[PDB]
């Protein structure tokens, strides 16, 4: 579609597991830095990882991001999940002014015990 960035409405993972999020963007944003942001208010969110506008994998703490500039999707991976990882997150594209952003709600469930 024509929205600058879109993701899944929600994604779910299990404590000690991993989850992946596909953030799809329109072709014109190829050479922009892409990021994964956490919390609210939306435009004060905490950046967890951000690319350098290349396809090189970036990792900070337990979060990875890899931009596929052929299919125009950047994939976020969250590993070694904790219950406190649950909450509101954002796919984003960095630009001067208001970024394109898309809200993803992250659900975490515990190890069955
Ligand atoms: Na901005």
Curated annotation (Swiss-Prot):
Induction: Up-regulated by interleukin-4/IL-4. Phosphorylated on tyrosine. Disulfide bonds join 23-91, 37-45. GO terms for biological process: interleukin-13-mediated signaling pathway; negative regulation of apoptotic cell clearance; negative regulation of mast cell activation; negative regulation of MyD88-dependent toll-like receptor signaling pathway; osteoclast differentiation; positive regulation of apoptotic cell clearance; positive regulation of interleukin-4-mediated signaling pathway; TRIF-dependent toll-like receptor signaling pathway. The keyword Membrane applies. Expressed in myeloid cells. Present on the surface of macrophages (at protein level). Highly expressed by alveolar, splenic macrophages and bone marrow-derived dendritic cells. Expression is increased following aeroallergen challenge in macrophages, mast cells, and eosinophils. GO terms for molecular function: ceramide binding; interleukin-4 receptor binding; phosphatidylserine binding; virus receptor activity. It is found in: Cell membrane. One of its GO terms (cellular component) is plasma membrane. Residues 21-27 are annotated as: Plays an important role in murine norovirus (MNV) binding. Residues 2-107 form the Ig-like V-type domain. Residues 2-113 are extracellular. Keywords: Cell membrane, Disulfide bond, Host cell receptor for virus entry, Immunity, Immunoglobulin domain, Lipid-binding, Membrane, Phosphoprotein, Receptor, Signal, Transmembrane, Transmembrane helix. Belongs to the CD300 family. Interacts with PTPN6/SHP-1 in a tyrosine phosphorylation dependent manner. Interacts with IL4R. Acts as an inhibitory receptor for myeloid cells and mast cells. Positively regulates the phagocytosis of apoptotic cells (efferocytosis) via phosphatidylserine (PS) recognition; recognizes and binds PS as a ligand which is expressed on the surface of apoptotic cells. Plays an important role in the maintenance of immune homeostasis, by promoting macrophage-mediated efferocytosis and by inhibiting dendritic cell-mediated efferocytosis. Negatively regulates Fc epsilon receptor-dependent mast cell activation and allergic responses via binding to ceramide which acts as a ligand. (Microbial infection) Acts as a functional receptor for murine norovirus (MNV). Mediates binding to the cell surface and is both necessary and sufficient for viral entry and replication. This interaction requires Mg(2+) and Ca(2+) and is enhanced by bile acids. Primary determinant of MNV species tropism and is sufficient to render cells permissive to infection by MNV. Can render nonmurine mammalian cells susceptible to MNV infection. This is CMRF35-like molecule 1. It comes from Mus musculus. The chain holds residues 20 to 131 of 337 of the full protein.
